[PDB]
Amino acid sequence: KRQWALEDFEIGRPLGKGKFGNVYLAREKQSKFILALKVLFKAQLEKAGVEHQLRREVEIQSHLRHPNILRLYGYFHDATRVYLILEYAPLGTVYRELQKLSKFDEQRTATYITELANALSYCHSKRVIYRDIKPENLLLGSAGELKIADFGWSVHLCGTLDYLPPEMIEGRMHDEKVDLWSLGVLCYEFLVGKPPFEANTYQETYKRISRVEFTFPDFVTEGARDLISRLLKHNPSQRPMLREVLEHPWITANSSKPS
Numbered sequence: 001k002r003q004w005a006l007e008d009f010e011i012g013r014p015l016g017k018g019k020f021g022n023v024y025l026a027r028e029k030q031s032k033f034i035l036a037l038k039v040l041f042k043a044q045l046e047k048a049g050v051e052h053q054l055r056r057e058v059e060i061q062s063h064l065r066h067p068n069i070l071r072l073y074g075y076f077h078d079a080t081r082v083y084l085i086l087e088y089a090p091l092g093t094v095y096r097e098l099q100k101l102s103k104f105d106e107q108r109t110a111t112y113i114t115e116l117a118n119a120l121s122y123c124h125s126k127r128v129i130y131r132d133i134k135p136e137n138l139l140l141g142s143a144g145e146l147k148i149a150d151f152g153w154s155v156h157l158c159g160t161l162d163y164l165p166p167e168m169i170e171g172r173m174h175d176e177k178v179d180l181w182s183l184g185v186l187c188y189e190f191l192v193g194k195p196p197f198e199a200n201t202y203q204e205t206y207k208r209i210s211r212v213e214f215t216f217p218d219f220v221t222e223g224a225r226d227l228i229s230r231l232l233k234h235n236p237s238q239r240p241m242l243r244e245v246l247e248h249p250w251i252t253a254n255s256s257k258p259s
């Protein structure tokens with residue numbers, strides 16, 4: 001845990017683009033360590049109340065260590081900018097992989113779900129609840145293992161509703177179960193190629209989520225449908241435990257990874 005400066009890193013190609021900031025491949029000069037460096041201008045941040053939100057997000061991230069959670073090594077700032085030192089994921093985002101492939105097979109989906117659940121169980125133990133997870137925020141390691149990247153929204157709406165649970169959008173207070181819903185949405189999107197509540201309109205998506213209106217294409221197997229339906233209950237209480245998800249026969253049948 002030391003203070004870092006831009007002089008310390010050689011900066012490479014951009015890994016990703018974002019309005020808040022851009023992510024660059026970087027190499028630490030002393031160790032030749034390869035990593036992603038995330039650059040945020042203070043001003044863009046200050047304009048919105050993120051400045052407190054970013055500091056808590058950084059605080060939460062630094063402490064967490066899991067195979068399926070993207071590591072944050074450190075942070076530093078320059079007169080006009082904030083820089084996040086992040087683990088680098090060679091195989092990139094699941095999002096890019098999904099739009100390259102268009103859908104995932106059950107074996108790849110089940111494996112991703114299992115890794116997600118494991119990562120989620122670990123977060124809950126630390127009293128960290130995630131709330132926002134989407135293929136854009138999922139990264140792949142050299143082994144091809146899923147990693148949870150952001151945490152920029154972590155706790156113990158003008159933005160997209162696609163992955164938000166009914167309780168959060170309706171203004172009801174929310175608990176861990178919120179993550180179980182996220183798992184159900186992701187599992188659907190992996191298999192089908194689109195999130196279950198996708199719509200032309202924020203207002204339209206609101207209603208679909210609120211009513212929990214989703215249908216399955218023919219190719220989705222009964223095993224998957226059962227898992228999704230359990231995950232996607234309107235009442236958080238009905239939603240299964242992570243352990244229950246890990247033990248689901250469909251997960252068990254098709255997963256590479258352990259519970």
Ligand SMILES: Nc1ncnc2c1ncn2[C@@H]1O[C@H](CO)[C@@H](O)[C@H]1O
Pocket residue numbers: 015016017018023035036086087088089090092093136137139149
């Ligand atoms: N460590 C990283 N390795 C690879 N791509 C990353 C990394 N951090 C962020 N990104 C990319 O930048 C985007 C913005 O966070 C991500 O969705 C992803 O595409």
